[PDB]
Design a protein around this ligand. Structure first.
Ligand SMILES: Nc1ncnc2c1ncn2[C@@H]1O[C@H](COP(=O)(O)OP(=O)(O)OP(O)(O)=S)[C@@H](O)[C@H]1O
Ligand SMILES: Nc1ncnc2c1ncn2[C@@H]1O[C@H](COP(=O)(O)OP(=O)(O)OP(O)(O)=S)[C@@H](O)[C@H]1O
Ligand SMILES: Nc1ncnc2c1ncn2[C@@H]1O[C@H](COP(=O)(O)OP(=O)(O)OP(O)(O)=S)[C@@H](O)[C@H]1O
Ligand SMILES: Nc1ncnc2c1ncn2[C@@H]1O[C@H](COP(=O)(O)OP(=O)(O)OP(O)(O)=S)[C@@H](O)[C@H]1O
Ligand SMILES: Nc1ncnc2c1ncn2[C@@H]1O[C@H](COP(=O)(O)OP(=O)(O)OP(O)(O)=S)[C@@H](O)[C@H]1O
Ligand SMILES: Nc1ncnc2c1ncn2[C@@H]1O[C@H](COP(=O)(O)OP(=O)(O)OP(O)(O)=S)[C@@H](O)[C@H]1O
Ligand SMILES: [Cl-]
Ligand SMILES: [Cl-]
Ligand SMILES: [Cl-]
Ligand SMILES: [Cl-]
Ligand SMILES: [Cl-]
Ligand SMILES: [Cl-]
Ligand SMILES: [Mg+2]
Ligand SMILES: [Mg+2]
Ligand SMILES: [Mg+2]
Ligand SMILES: [Mg+2]
Ligand SMILES: [Mg+2]
Ligand SMILES: [Mg+2]
Lengths: 220, 227, 228, 225, 222, 224
């Protein structure tokens, strides 16, 4: 079948029927504070700690120092991983996609990375046609490189377009939606795997919490 | 000159819903949100043509590489690599440059493959890419040309397109369903926190079909619809 | 037709429609027929011409803007209608204004020439939407078309597209105001089932039944069921 | 020194709902979706004025030809050609084959020539269809000139939703002294016609929707208390 | 020195809801769809100031002529012509934009009539970019404040439960906001008044039903 | 392991919901429709800092004048003029007169140094921008500079719907480290005020809406 890499994010590998397909790109979309960055960091962190698979984290707005500081509260020492050459945080603050792809490819080769997180890829972008065009090019090259990639995207409603530009979910191999739904006056976080090309997966929404240990999903 | 004939898809349940299959020599639009089964439907159409009727097929891919189309079909126990090695399936790669729109050129290429592989079935996935660059009025007219030129070749064609809501416009520009002869809608609807897949034949010009939505699942044997 | 109404009508002979319209379509006027995709717009317009020819020997002109004459003819065989025979006999003319795989003045003259040449009493234009970008220019051009057909004395069915079952009548928000008569075909999806209805929204100068009436499309074309 | 007085429409039910009729010397906007009875309301207003009170009328049409107006009015038992012949009704044809100032002067000569007290303009929308700021200013000017002339005027406008904007540009209902809304509501596959007086500046009226039908004798509105 | 003082409207029910009336020396936005009672409220504010407190008023009108304002107020048994003749009320005709000039005219009228109360109806007429609307309205509000007027400014809106005014900014530069609604439900209309906000002071919350009668606005406590 | 430090607002109920207060050295977006208590929250933040912890504060105003801000705070029994006199509070008047972001930042930096304030409120930050993508770039720049200074900052923003976009341009909530939403929901003719902490990067907080009232004592939130 299709080989999958384990995220080791509690509950997620069950929902994805074994993890994220190796060598492919997964879109992780959500409104603000849904857990996008956390998912993308946990993906790299677990890869390093449990499988010694090095990772590249690409950030467009949040600084490397804040990413590191924020991860500290889950008890994750990212600076240590950076110091040991197992993690590389690529600062993409200030669009030349060619330059970005070359920088990513270089980091991947230099750190021998198997896992890549790009957070958020919507910061790369104004017509739908060109967004789709340029996103496709990024996805295609990471595939050629053989990276397994998480790309986060922003969205503005819980039920509504998958991402900002109405094309991102059609270009990605895999699509994960993080929701933070307000019901009555209470928030409930859920994760859904909408699509995984070429393989089976659990369907619909599953509740999760963010705790001191990161994302915890219960597929029941 | 006779009331339009149909070719069996052999996709279980679909030939009942369509009262005989897809109208021959015409295009059928298959529209749906992400991960609804559009590529799968279009592959299963060709695969069944080859296996059940020894009718060769041409698959036109605009985004996925042929290798990924092949890989993704293994999930269903379909050996597309062998079908390609045998000359029964041809995957026409129209996907673009990773490292660096002419419609009649595409038609030229499709027509050539159709003649070379003696193909009776064609899939184009996703059609959206043809009209991707541009106004609803422009999209409309470009889809019109493609449909017409495919009809001239005699191809029976499945063409897929995208939509972003389960119960909103048929496709993206609000014109695709008016230019198409035949329209199928794949939905993936939330009920509670669970999903329910359905297939609808909205229209088939000049012929009959069952109405409304019918539930289906995607399994290890592909699409399974229950009328 | 009931006697005490101001506007003379011609019968469509479409089962149930002449009841709902209280006698048929107003003579010498245009009737807008709008609907989402696959609602029966072309079928209604063809059935109007076919019945006119078959029942009253009234010749008809069909103006098609996207479907080819060959496909209109082919699809009509679904109903056991031999339109090629009527074209051969000079009783039906299909005017092909469909795109090569907009000059309205030239179009009107083609239509006029065909109507004179074939001595046609019934005209169908399918879809008039394709004639058209500002709502104001759509309105005056539609108005111009309607006025010329009226001067010519034709009785016309003009189909238009719409994208929601309940929502705008046509595409530009003006078509239903310029037309004398408005018919809406719906194909409502509810609880995973489709049901077709026809509504006569307005008919200037006469009464008509109000609201939605069910219909089906079968081997014999449109069948409408008027209810109390 | 008195609060504004009203002119009877003699449209069944309407003079009750408006507590006496349309405010005299002012314009009333009558808005509705397609086939709601706007032209009917605006004709019935003139027709009743002539028949019941010998008050001459001017009808300004921007789309429908005078011939079709006259023909369609026979549906309601009205012989408008006879009224035109007697010089009690004048139909001013402003329909297309827009200088508003010029049109206003032409309306004024008719009003003077036929000594009209009642005016209908149908639809005042089509004047405008070629910026809301411009629509507002031009409508205001037309309303003010009619008021100066002393006419009591019905102005129809189009709208595209039963329970949405009052008219097309989101400004008509603010520059009008009086607003009437004709609806044609579709519920459970049946249509229900209703009439509402939304506002009459400086005077009272009944509130909300009242059901009506169109008959061989025109509009019949049904109040109930 | 103190929390802000209020000036009584004497509009039945309103001084209760607002716990004393309108904040003195400030502007209150009064927003509403067509025929909600905006003009009536702004007239009744001036009329009561004159009749009850001998506080002169300036009414700024942008579309309705002074003659029609006066005529329409007869519906309530108010003789505004008399008050204008006595020098207690001035109807400033800004009918059929230079905001600086308008403001100097208002200032001139306030000085001339020693007015304490001002109504501007509708202030949206001044603006027919949301960014320029915001800056113009803020400028108008600040000058009125500097002059010392207590002001009612009405605005149009097009939905009962949508944006507060037309440009999506008017409620943010106003110190005080009142919304008049005329909600259609099951074929019946129901008028309500709501005090949405009064900066730096208290007020009752939500919608209160009111009617317009022969004697003006009556607000009922629910 | 290592927790994000927070400074107490001492606003009744808020420090419970935020599990300790606002993240120190960062900006917290406080968004809401008109009259939701945005300015009051901003002021109470600074006021409580001075009164309870002797932490000086800088209030940056963009429309309301200092005199009106002072006048309105009297509603709650707070004497801000006295605090300005004692050099404990500085009101930075950037309000209109009848836009250079770098100058403003330098003005704020100078005031922060001069008064050695730990707490800053910018009300409303929307006035800085009024294209969504340039708004995003500008707001980011402001957040970064304030962070560079070490200020703990409340930034208010406007929104026009109770359950729509967090703020006006659909980007402000993505650039901010922390996001608080004040709502004033109209249901069945009655209004209900609620506060929600939507997001605090790097740290925990209670979820959903909590009802509050505005009274003579300012904001009172009920975590129930
Ligand atoms: N130690 C913790 N314990 C509990 N919840 C935490 C903890 N750390 C962070 N969180 C929660 O996780 C959220 C942050 O998740 P992120 O992954 O940063 O979200 P995000 O979707 O990337 O949001 P952006 O980029 O700001 S739009 C915070 O808003 C908290 O609710
Ligand atoms: N063996 C399998 N069993 C069950 N479901 C499967 C299996 N293989 C694939 N799927 C499902 O099929 C979906 C993929 O269907 P596709 O036909 O590729 O969808 P699509 O509509 O073409 O989506 P795009 O092109 O990426 S937007 C996956 O998201 C899975 O849910
Ligand atoms: N023999 C038949 N029996 C039953 N239904 C039929 C038959 N032939 C055609 N139909 C139906 O009629 C529909 C076609 O109606 P049309 O008149 O072509 O619609 P249309 O409104 O003109 O749609 P367009 O032009 O494609 S948007 C098909 O989608 C079928 O559902
Ligand atoms: N004798 C009658 N009995 C009952 N209803 C009638 C009769 N005559 C006409 N009608 C109705 O009156 C409607 C037309 O009324 P109009 O006043 O023309 O409406 P309208 O709002 O002006 O429509 P426009 O201008 O075409 S959008 C028709 O659609 C019929 O429903
Ligand atoms: N004597 C009265 N008795 C009852 N209601 C009355 C009386 N006089 C006027 N009204 C009502 O008051 C309304 C007019 O209120 P206004 O204050 O003019 O509203 P408005 O919001 O200013 O409307 P505009 O400016 O036309 S959008 C009328 O539509 C009547 O419903
Ligand atoms: N003493 C008080 N008692 C009760 N409520 C009060 C008191 N003082 C003020 N308020 C309320 O506080 C609100 C003002 O809150 P603000 O913080 O000024 O709101 P805001 O969100 O900044 O509004 P803007 O800036 O005008 S959009 C008023 O509308 C009153 O409802
Ligand atoms: Cl959580
Ligand atoms: Cl499934
Ligand atoms: Cl049917
Ligand atoms: Cl009726
Ligand atoms: Cl009332
Ligand atoms: Cl409160
Ligand atoms: Mg993030
Ligand atoms: Mg696909
Ligand atoms: Mg058709
Ligand atoms: Mg009319
Ligand atoms: Mg008014
Ligand atoms: Mg404020």
């Amino acid at each position: 079948a299709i080989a999958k890499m384990r995220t080791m994010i509690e509950g997620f590998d069950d929902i994805s029927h074994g993890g994220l397909p190796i060598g492919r790109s997964t879109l992780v979309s959500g409104t603000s504070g849904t857990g996008k960055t956390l998912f993308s960091i946990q993906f790299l962190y677990n890869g390093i700690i449990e499988f010694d698979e090095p990772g590249v984290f690409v950030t467009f707005e949040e600084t490397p120092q804040d990413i590191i500081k924020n991860a500290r509260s889950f008890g994750w020492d990212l600076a240590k991983l950076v110091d040991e050459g197992k993690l590389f945080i690529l600062d993409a603050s200030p669009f030349d996609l060619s330059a970005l792809i070359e920088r990513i490819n270089y980091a991947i080769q230099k750190y021998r990375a198997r896992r890549v997180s790009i957070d958020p890829v919507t910061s790369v972008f104004d017509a739908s046609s060109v967004v789709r065009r340029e996103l496709f090019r990024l996805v295609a090259r990471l595939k050629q490189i053989g990276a397994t990639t998480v790309m986060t995207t922003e969205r503005i409603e819980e039920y509504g377009p998958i991402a900002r530009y109405g094309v991102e979910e059609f270009v990605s191999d895999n699509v994960v939606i993080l929701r933070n739904v307000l019901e009555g006056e209470r928030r409930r976080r859920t994760l859904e795997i909408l699509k995984l090309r070429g393989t089976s997966h659990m369907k619909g929404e599953y509740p999760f919490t963010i705790t001191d240990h990161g994302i915890n999903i219960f597929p029941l």
